[PDB]
Amino acid sequence: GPGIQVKALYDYDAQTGDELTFKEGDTIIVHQKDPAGWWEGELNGKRGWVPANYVQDI
Amino acid sequence: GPGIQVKALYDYDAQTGDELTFKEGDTIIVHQKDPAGWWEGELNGKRGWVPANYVQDI
């Protein structure tokens, strides 16, 4: 479908342009597992970067 | 001519079919500024999609 579901393992507060903020337990849709450690994700009506080491595929 | 020249502002690694991979500083010929955020570009003998927010008209 739109991508894979991952669960945020930790809280993350966006620090730079187009990063998502999320909390531990948030389900994030990962649209792309881009190289470079930041994945294109979507949460709560925002698309943006998610640090790949913060999420677990569920 | 063949289109406008743009400079890549950031590295982009192609994630899907027919996207261009490029590096910051690449000069890309934009053949068409298609609606939907991805433009028809050309770089290094490949034609493909370029994310429009990654390039600056030069």
Partner: peptide, 18 residues
Amino acid sequence: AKPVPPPRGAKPAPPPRT
């Protein structure tokens, strides 16, 4: 109790392809 984020590319998210 969390890992450090990976180094950033300083770039915007690509527009939706979908």
